[PDB]
Write a protein that binds this DNA or RNA. Structure first.
Ligand SMILES: Cc1cn([C@H]2C[C@H](O)[C@@H](COP(=O)(O)OP(=O)(O)OP(=O)(O)O)O2)c(=O)[nH]c1=O
Ligand SMILES: *P(=O)(O)OC[C@@H]1CC[C@H](n2ccc(N)nc2=O)O1
Ligand SMILES: [Mg+2]
Ligand SMILES: [Mg+2]
Length: 323
DNA sequence: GCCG
DNA sequence: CAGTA
DNA sequence: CGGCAGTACTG
């Protein structure tokens, strides 16, 4: 749809990402998307360069696959890449940890299990290695959001619970369940992680915690593992955010994504002198190297339609925000 | 990697 | 803070 | 030349 050159460029982009080339991998990912998001198959080098996201270097790699049906660079990928990919797919381990485990001589999850030094999160990630690479049907994500909502609404009926991420973008499968919690009164959303997590543990729903700062009263997120009851259940990842009602549209926009749509909209805000985050859309933001020097003023954004409007953009329903 |  | 998210 | 989103835990 309408190119197989992306299949070859994805192998080389995955290789740079696992090796830590964060920015070289990004350039490849944007070129891959531009190639998947195009009408007529690319037949010329000038036709390849005309597309935004494809430069001279990327066009000549596309001209090599068109002429030869083979990209020479793939025959000289580091032999470590499959192992680094295997290790970075552990929750809590990234490019740095995987490179370190590789230098130390580990080549399998058996060597990680028996010989590696694992963090608490890395040990939970390894314990659910397959389940965590598995996507659930959106119907199970409904069961999970309904579980979190029932426990949250049980102690405070006014609480608003919404499933975001891929679920809200109408996707058929979900990597995890992203639940946003808020309160229309603007003050009762405070200190509910204590009660909500307590409640979900009493019923044996939460199996493990990955990120959960419960010592602080200003805990913003919960990242953990859950499992619905009955046979045939797998362990599913859960992501909960509790936000002030005033920041609802921005938190809802942020948490619906995609990650690439948020980046694209935030980069656009930067060009209009504004700043967009999960908390607020700000204006008159002073910047130096593109870093915040001044705070600016928060703009009133009661709904997601106001964020698009204040940025001079037409509204995009969640399903049209995949990129 | 790409682009201002 | 660097790593990971 | 140099930024590539902006922010939240963990130890
Ligand atoms: C990972 C990531 C997520 N987010 C936002 C947008 C995502 O839609 C939202 C939820 O995070 P994710 O759950 O990682 O993404 P997802 O729901 O789109 O897809 P998946 O089915 O793979 O779970 O958080 C960012 O803004 N930046 C990031 O780098
Ligand atoms: P993890 O499962 O990859 O991430 C869980 C949540 C999703 C939103 C948040 N996140 C992840 C990565 C980045 N770069 N920024 C974020 O806000 O962590
Ligand atoms: Mg990982
Ligand atoms: Mg998700």
């Amino acid at each position: 749809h309408n190119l197989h050159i992306t299949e070859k460029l994805e192998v080389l982009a995955k290789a740079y990402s696992v090796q830590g080339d964060k920015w070289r991998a990004l350039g490849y990912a944007k070129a891959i998307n531009a190639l998947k998001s195009f009408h007529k198959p690319v037949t010329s080098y000038q036709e390849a360069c005309s597309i935004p996201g494809i430069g001279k270097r990327m066009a000549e790699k596309i001209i090599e696959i068109l002429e030869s049906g083979h990209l020479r660079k793939l025959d000289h990928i580091s032999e470590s890449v499959p192992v680094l990919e295997l290790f970075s797919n552990i929750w809590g381990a990234g490019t740095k940890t995987a490179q370190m485990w590789y230098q130390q001589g580990f080549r399998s999850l058996e060597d990680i299990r028996s010989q590696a030094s694992l963090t608490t999160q890395q040990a939970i990630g390894l314990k659910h290695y397959s389940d965590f690479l598995e996507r659930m049907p959106r119907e199970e994500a409904t069961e999970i959001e309904q579980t979190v909502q029932k426990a949250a609404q049980a102690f405070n009926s006014g609480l608003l619970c919404v499933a975001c991420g891929s679920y809200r973008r109408g996707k058929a499968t979900c990597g995890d369940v992203d639940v946003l919690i808020t309160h229309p009164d603007g003050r009762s959303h405070r200190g509910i992680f204590s009660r909500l997590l307590d409640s979900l543990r009493q019923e044996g729903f939460l199996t493990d915690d990955l990120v959960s700062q419960e010592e602080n009263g200003q805990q913003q997120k919960y990242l953990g593992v859950c499992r619905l009851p009955g046979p045939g259940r797998r362990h599913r990842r859960l992501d909960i955010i509790v936000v002030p009602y005033s920041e609802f549209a921005c938190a809802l926009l942020y948490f619906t994504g995609s990650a690439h749509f948020n980046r694209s909209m935030r980069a656009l805000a930067k060009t209009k002198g504004m700043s967009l985050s999960e908390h607020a859309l700000s204006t008159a933001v002073v910047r130096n190297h593109g870093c915040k020097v001044g705070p600016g003023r928060v703009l009133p954004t009661p709904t997601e339609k106001d964020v698009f409007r204040l940025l001079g953009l037409p509204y995009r329903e969640p399903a049209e925000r995949d990129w």
